[PDB]
C-alpha cells in the first residue's frame, strides 16, 4: 500500500475537516490523527507538513482523489478515519455519524469500530 | 431566476439523504423539511419523488462532484437548503449543526449561521 | 322509545407505550435500510390517530431514541387485544400505498406483529380500523 | 457450543420459526440450516423438533425478552444464527436481510455482514 503526496494530503484533509466538524478542541483527538498518519509510513514532521500543505486544497478536491481509489486503500482510509475519534475503543452516536457521512460521500467501505482498530494494527 | 439541471437537482437530494442518514435515525421532521423545501429549486411534488429515485442510482462521490463545482450563488442555496432541514425553530443542535458543517466542507459550500439559511431560503 | 344506558369507552396510551408504538413504526420502515418519506408522513399523521395533540409528536418520537426496540416490544405484547388491533392496524396502513401492500412489506408487517402478539389481518381491515 | 439454556434455545427456536414464517413460505432447504445450526447450540438432530414443539409454550414476545437481556456474546451467537438461515452461497437477499435486520433490531441483537454470520457459525 503505496500512496502519493498529493493522496495523502487527501487523506490528511479528510481527518481533518472530520475532526473540525463540531468546533470543539479536542487534544487527544488531534493526537490520534497525527500519531497514526504515520501508520502509513512517514515520520511525525512530514505529518505536520502534508496537514498544513491540505490547507491548500479543496476538501471536495480529496474528496475526488480518494473515491478513485481500489478497494483495498479505501479499506485503511476508512479504517484510519474510525480509529481517530475512538475513545477506549469506543465512538459516541454523533461520532459514528461523521465517520458514515465521511465514508458515503467518499465512497468508503462501511465497518464496525473494531474492525478499524483491528485493520490500523496490521499496517 | 435561479435553475438548476436534473443530475445537479439529483446531487442534491442525495447530500441531503446522505446527511439525514448518517446517525442511522429517521427524524420525521428532517424528511419533511427535505422534501418540502425541495420545490423551492423550482420543481413539483412529482420531480421530488422521482429525484428521490434517481438519487440511488448514483454514487455520494459523483454528487460531491457535482455540487462542488456549482457558482457561489447555487452553492449558497445548497448550503442553505442543507440547513434548514436540520433546524428546528431557527435553532440547531451541536450533533447536526457538526454534520451540517462537515457535508459544507466536502461539498465545497460556504459557512453560514442557521439564520442566515433560514433566510436564503424564503428568497427563493 | 326507549334510550338507554349509555356506554362510553376511551382508547387510552401511557406516554411510554405512544414512544413504543412509534418506536416499533421507525423499527418496520427502516428494516429495509431505504428511506420513503411518504411511508414516514403516514407515519406521523396517523400517530395522532393515537390521541395527542400535533405538538407533542415531536417529543415523544425523540422520546423513543432512550429506549430500546425491545423494551417497546414488551410494551406492546402486555396489551390487551383491543389496543394490538388498533396497533396493528397502524403499522399496518404505513406501509400501504393506494390501500395495497407488496408481499415484502406484508413480510415485515407480519414479523413485527408475531413479535409483538398483534393480530393478523389483511391490509383491508387494516386501513377500515384506522378510519373508524 | 455457546452454552444456551434450556429456556434460551426454545427462545431462539421461536425467534428463527417467526422469521421463516415471515413471507408465508417455509422452504425446506432453510428449514435444513435451521436444524443442522441449533445443532451446534448442543441439541440433537431428532430434537429440533422437540424444541420447536416446546417453543409453542411461550409466546414471542417472551422470546424476544429472553434473547434482549443476553450478554453481547451470547447475542453474537442468536443474531449469527438467524444471519445463517436465508442465506445462500454466502448471499442474502435484499428482502431477507430486511427480515433478519428487524428481527435483530427487536432482539436487540448486533448488526453484522451475512458473511460475519457465516464464519461466526464456521
Ligand atoms: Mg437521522
Ligand atoms: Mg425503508
Ligand atoms: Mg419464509
Redesign the interface.
Known amino acids: 500500500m503505496t500512496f502519493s503526496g498529493q493522496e495523502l494530503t487527501a487523506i490528511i484533509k479528510m481527518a481533518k ?2 475532526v ?4 470543539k478542541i479536542k487534544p487527544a483527538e488531534i493526537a490520534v490523527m497525527t500519531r497514526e498518519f504515520m501508520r502509513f509510513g512517514i515520520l511525525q514532521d512530514q505529518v505536520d507538513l502534508l496537514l498544513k500543505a491540505s490547507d491548500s486544497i ?3 478536491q480529496a ?2 482523489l480518494i ?1 478513485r481509489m481500489d478497494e483495498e486503500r479505501k479499506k485503511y482510509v476508512a479504517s484510519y478515519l474510525g480509529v481517530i475519534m475512538a475513545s477506549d475503543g469506543d465512538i459516541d ?2 461520532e ?3 465517520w ?3 465514508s ?4 468508503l467501505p462501511t465497518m464496525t469500530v473494531m474492525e478499524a482498530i483491528n485493520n490500523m494494527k496490521n499496517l
Open positions: 475537516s472530520m473540525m466538524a463540531d468546533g479543496e476538501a471536495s474528496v475526488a473515491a452516536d454523533n459514528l455519524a461523521l458514515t457521512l465521511i458515503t460521500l467518499c465512497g
